[PDB]
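Subject: complex prediction, re-run

Hi both,

The earlier run crashed halfway through, so I resubmitted it with identical inputs.
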Amino acid sequence: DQLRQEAEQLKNQIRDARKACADATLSQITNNIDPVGRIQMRTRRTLRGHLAKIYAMHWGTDSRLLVSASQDGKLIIWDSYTTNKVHAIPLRSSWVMTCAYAPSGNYVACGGLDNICSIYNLKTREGNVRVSRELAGHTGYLSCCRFLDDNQIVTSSGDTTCALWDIETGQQTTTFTGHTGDVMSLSLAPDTRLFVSGACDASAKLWDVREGMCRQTFTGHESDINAICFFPNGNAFATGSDDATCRLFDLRADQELMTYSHDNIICGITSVSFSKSGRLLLAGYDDFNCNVWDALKADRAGVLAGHDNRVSCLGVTDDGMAVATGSWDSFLKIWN
Amino acid sequence: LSAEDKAAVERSKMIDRNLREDGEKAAREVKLLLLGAGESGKSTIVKQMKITGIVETHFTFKDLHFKMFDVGAQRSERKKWIHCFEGVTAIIFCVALSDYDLVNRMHESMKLFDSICNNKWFTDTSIILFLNKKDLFEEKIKKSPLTICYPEYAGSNTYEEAAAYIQCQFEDLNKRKDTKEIYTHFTCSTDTKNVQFVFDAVTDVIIKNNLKDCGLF
Amino acid sequence: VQLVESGGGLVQPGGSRKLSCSASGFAFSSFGMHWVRQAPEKGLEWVAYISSGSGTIYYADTVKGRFTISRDDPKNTLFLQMTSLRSEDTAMYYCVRSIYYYGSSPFDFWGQGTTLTVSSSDIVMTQATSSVPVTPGESVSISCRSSKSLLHSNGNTYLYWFLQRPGQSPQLLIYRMSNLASGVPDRFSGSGSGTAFTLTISRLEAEDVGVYYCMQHLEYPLTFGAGTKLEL
Amino acid sequence: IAQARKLVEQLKMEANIDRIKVSKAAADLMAYCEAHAKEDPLLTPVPASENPF
Amino acid sequence: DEKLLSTVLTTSYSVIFIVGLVGNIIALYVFLGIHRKRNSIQIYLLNVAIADLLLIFCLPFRIMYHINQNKWTLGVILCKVVGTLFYMNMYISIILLGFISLDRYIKINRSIQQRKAITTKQSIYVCCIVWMLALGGFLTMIILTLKKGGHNSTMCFHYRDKHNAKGEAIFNFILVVMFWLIFLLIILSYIKIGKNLLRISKRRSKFPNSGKYATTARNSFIVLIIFTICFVPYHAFRFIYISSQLNVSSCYWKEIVHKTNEIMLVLSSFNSCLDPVMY
Ligand SMILES: CCCC/C=C/CCCCCCCC(=O)OC[C@@H](O)COP(=O)(O)OC[C@@H](N)C(=O)O
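This time it finished cleanly. Structure:
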């Protein structure tokens, strides 16, 4: 009956307990800090061989090998220093929308409109590549997948859920609920102990892999969120949405600090990533080009225009020497 | 300049070679996307041919391989995955003719038709319309007239007229009548032409595309 | 995984022969294939190599013109045709698999061999020592010397360490002077810098006694060492 | 009312926690950014000899 | 020995310059700016645009010679090889227009027949072949007509006389027969494309996509009417220019010859502006 009241009142407390913890307006704190200026990058490599749109990519921890997934029914592995193909995995479902590369390097994963996360083993005798598990139990469509170790993996689905599995059996060890919309983005933390999800109800949520409870909920957007990434300190993240706007959220303050926007930018955002230092945030847009932002002043610092169609995926490597962008034009591009 | 690394290139070339053969082959099939009103005819249309998310149906007719994608078991935000099909050869759209009396359904079917035909991704994609269940439409006329659905309908309450009125009220919903065509068909139980019609329409589409490629449209 | 060779027996000088290697348990088509020899009381010498796709072949300067290597992939078989046999060809022949991509372990599986006997600008890898007695429990080291730096511009150092036990076939221990194969304990370690390399064995144990061999994969032809024996 | 008390039980948990002031957070951010400005090869272009691309 | 023609050349070439120029620069902006992808036929059309554009760039050296009353100013070796470039361009736009009409036939005369297999990667091969081989004739003609003698006499683009350089009178014959081969190659393709594209408009009746299949057929006939209306007058008359200048004549017949060859050549050049406009 009156249960729909205490919540509202209760919510009004939060809206006030995070307005007294706001005094600095970071854009003011970092007013004297020396700017970065302007950043020029150049296409060093171009990786050809895909016959359709590529919908995702992922780097390896060696900072040399990467994997890409396309809707031609192909998952290709590349040496980036030569442009040589190490493996080409043919899938059963051409409708793939995500990919991952295990930290060790023995496994990859894929998924999409079939509602199944398929794990593939690369380092096996017989000199082939075999599917080891087909994790099923979702009802939507796989929108992201991330490894914790070689026997654990987190998944997000368009059924308003996320899940933590156990690959040896193939059963959900935990199921994360609370969203009211298709979930579209994931980011794990450095410690691989608490992760963050970004949904189409214009919200983000911070989970806790150990228990299964949402510790904090973040709002502020005016449309669907499609991308999210963690700051390297593990104490902040960034979100990209269809309102042509990125935002930075802090966990402890439980607010947002900076918004990254521009009047002459009206397209949506498909991807987000940081730099090894956490000083320049990269973003992939639908206007066919990527942009670079100074994440302490909100100014721009550079543009990456080499693609003849949407930038769907964007990644940065753990050593910090390169960026890789993917496009619907069936091309990946390395920048330095 | 190199080493046994040479053998790592001779490999990357045996890979780049099979991707071609996979694309020089997946380009001679025809991909179709199947949509329809809520549980109207999207099922019987498949059984008319004799061969968990998306359902792929592969079949063949006169040395031409068709792949039909049925995605009704995918209840989600369609705005987020309906661009995976941009580049599909055609859209089959199945609507019924016994759905005006029932409940109102023809109106939402037309809403979906207008939401699909006039989409950013299907500005060039042709549509094959199947108006099905005409046998029963013959009976739901005598008892119930048509004006119960379309007030502005002022004409002979008969098959050869109401069917054409529905056809027109469906076909006058494409705003870009100059870039895509709409093919329409009333289904026959036996004498399986429901697939010869698809064959004709598809070959017409293919010719109309080859002629645009050759710059002498 | 399996590799069975056949086609060897007593023949006469001037004759001809054909040896066959049947594979069972792996993707024969994705693997390049080698033939290797071992004379009765001597070391290992290389013979021929054919790639995946067969669009690349290499012979030694001792058999060119009178040998021919081929492969039938549909039937998973490797062939060596030999003409004009001399007494310098009595040996045990071994069929070897090798796959090349970033991070691969070539020369990983060998066969059991065919014993043939007929009636009566290259790198030089040197293994000074030829015999070493030891006791189970202590540590050991073995040294290899090359007449040319094996390090390359890409950063890789192409040296391979093999082990042959009494009455068995060789077995890859180490590839590229630092990497350890799949199926060998951590006792074995590799080290060194161009023109000199070292293998270290700690907390020794039985079954580690036999003949150790050095190999280079920098440029064809390929070359082995004389073989360092390690017994009790 | 069928699944609305869990909403309250949750909102009673997202509110009873500490919240440092934005000043400290911005400070930690800028500090982490400074301390690691040398190993940022996208911020400080590096000698081509130390560049594998 | 004629002046009333020295006005026709200028009055025509002058407008042809600007029309071809604007058309080809717009066509390049399209094939490069708007269209970032390119099938084989777009490649061929881009090559043709480049060819006739730099031809046009070789045009304005005419009005000089003309309004200046047959000037011989710019050089003695320049204007010699300025018409060689004219011809080297006017013959690339006749082989590319013969390979276009073959791709454009093998495509339209097969839907599920799979007559042959072609891709938009082997097209750049031939497009560069026709641009390299062309130098085989360019430098050949330079070295043959330049270092083997000299004749200027305040003349350029003049009526020449053989019996001293009888090596070019044969190369020209070879080119004139190559044109007549490509002509049939083109005609028996753009006739078929209109034959097996007009019944389809009568059999496949009671059907929406029937307006097209008839515009296309009377477009694939204009694409040929244009060609033949321009290049056939030349390349046929030429037979009485190669010969009959290689032979004995008078200042009457051998003046008729020149004064008609120039008109026929301006006609053949009027096609460097009609090709961009085929939208
Ligand atoms: C295998 C074939 C490859 C295709 C490429 C070959 C391109 C050939 C370009 C060489 C010109 C062809 C001969 C020719 O006919 O041209 C002669 C002019 O070099 C005279 O120069 P002009 O004095 O200015 O001609 C004025 C007029 N009186 C006349 O002779 O035609």
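The pocket of VF0 is lined by residues E 83-84, 87-88, 91, 133-134, 137, 141, 157, 160, 171-172, 175 (CB under 6 Å).

- K.
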